Design a protein around this ligand. Structure first.
Ligand SMILES: COc1ccc(-c2nsc(C)c2C(=O)NC(=N)NCc2cc(Cl)c(N)c(Cl)c2)cc1
Length: 387
């Protein structure tokens, strides 16, 4: 799948995007890859943060669905006008499909300054598409209209250090393989967790460790009210109760150095003299996921190189600075970009499962590596799910 290798650009904090064209003649747009929503939507009107937008009046193949759509979130929102048009992915499978497009006409805190994407590709299932599950998501259209296998896989590559405007534009941000698995993007084995329900990409976490120490919470808490793999979220987001126990435990493990409470709230950055980030003082985090074989689980291990997100210093000095990329969630566990950066992630929609393997581009040190390991004999995993 050489054509699709290196087709992504971007970073954790502003999202990873892929190049796409919409309309006739093809209008090129950069589109945020998002496994946590289900709408294909693009800027269709001038905006302070958009360099280009979809111009329906200039597409001969544009079709107006004569229907509005409103898509709100906690952090931002957009509203637009539904329609269909021809879509291709230049560095994807060699195909053109007719798919639904939401032409965005108003937005609040959706388009991020300097992110370089002009639209969003919701890769989740119909159930959570707006306005209703009737609006066929892009990937479903793709599978129906072509011979592309019902499968895609993501390696998001964090740099491990800040990237300026010029550098993020020039760097490879990773790969989205549409229709397959590329073996060069990972090392070791692929372990699969079942997709519990086809709405978000929902999984079940059965156990959490901080430096091997069991958080010893009741299973159900880790997936209250859900647990999802979410491309378009920056942080690892943890439910209120899990977040507090996690932070208490990370604070204890890193006790030899003290940090402002604003750091632990994900607000304030911490800096160290160039090259002196004390990675070793921070614990690894292990998340155990339900396996495919009954009574069997496996674990994914992330390093502080994952949960500490590189941000450029306030006065741009030589210092290495980071934000704590774990936040409180009021709507379940979100395995965001920072987690996904550790792993090659296979969204096997055909076999209703999600694959994890150690990423060939994950940031580590010489003493410690990210890990995907198993199996473990775990019981009653089914009732860690919320209902
Ligand atoms: C910053 O604080 C946050 C607060 C809540 C949740 C969150 N909790 S659960 C779940 C499924 C989500 C989720 O929305 N994931 C996703 N890709 N949403 C779409 C989207 C992408 C962008 Cl780039 C923008 N600007 C906007 Cl507004 C929406 C995520 C982040």
């Amino acid at each position: 799948f050489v054509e699709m290798v290196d087709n992504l650009r971007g970073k954790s904090g502003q999202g990873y995007y892929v190049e796409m064209t919409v309309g006739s003649p093809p209008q090129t747009l950069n589109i945020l890859v998002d496994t946590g929503s289900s709408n294909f939507a693009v800027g269709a009107a001038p905006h302070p943060f958009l360099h280009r937008y979809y111009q329906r009046q200039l597409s001969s193949t544009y079709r107006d669905l004569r229907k509005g759509v409103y898509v709100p979130y906690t952090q931002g929102k957009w509203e637009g006008e539904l329609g269909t048009d021809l879509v291709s992915i230049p560095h994807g499978p060699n195909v053109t499909v007719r798919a639904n497009i939401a032409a965005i006409t108003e937005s609040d805190k959706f388009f991020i300054n300097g992110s370089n994407w002009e639209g969003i590709l919701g890769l989740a299932y119909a159930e959570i598409a707006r306005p209703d599950d009737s609006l066929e998501p892009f990937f479903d259209s793709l599978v129906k209209q072509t011979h592309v296998p019902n499968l895609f896989s993501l390696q998001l590559c964090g740099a491990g250090f800040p990237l300026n405007q010029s550098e993020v534009l020039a760097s490879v941000g990773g790969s989205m393989i549409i229709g397959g698995i590329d073996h060069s993007l990972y090392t070791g084995s692929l372990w699969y967790t079942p997709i519990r329900r086809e709405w978000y990409y929902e999984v079940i976490i059965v156990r959490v460790e901080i430096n091997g120490q069991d958080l010893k919470m009741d299973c159900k808490e880790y997936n209250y009210d859900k647990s999802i793999v979410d491309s378009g979220t920056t942080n690892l987001r943890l439910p209120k109760k899990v977040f507090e126990a996690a932070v208490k435990s990370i604070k204890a493990a890193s006790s030899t150095e003290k940090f402002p409470d604003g750091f632990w709230l994900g607000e304030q950055l911490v800096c160290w003299q160039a090259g002196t980030t004390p990675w070793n003082i921070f614990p690894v985090i292990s998340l155990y996921l339900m396996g495919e074989v009954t009574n069997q689980s496996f674990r994914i291990t992330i390093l502080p190189q994952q949960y500490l997100r590189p941000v450029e210093d306030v006065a741009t000095s030589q210092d290495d600075c980071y934000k704590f990329a774990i936040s409180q969630s009021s709507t379940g566990t979100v395995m965001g970009a920072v987690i996904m950066e550790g792993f090659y992630v296979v969204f096997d929609r055909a076999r209703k499962r999600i694959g994890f393997a150690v990423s060939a581009c994950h940031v580590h040190d010489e003493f410690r590596t990210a890990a995907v390991e198993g199996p473990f004999v775990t019981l009653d995993m089914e009732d860690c799910g919320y209902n």
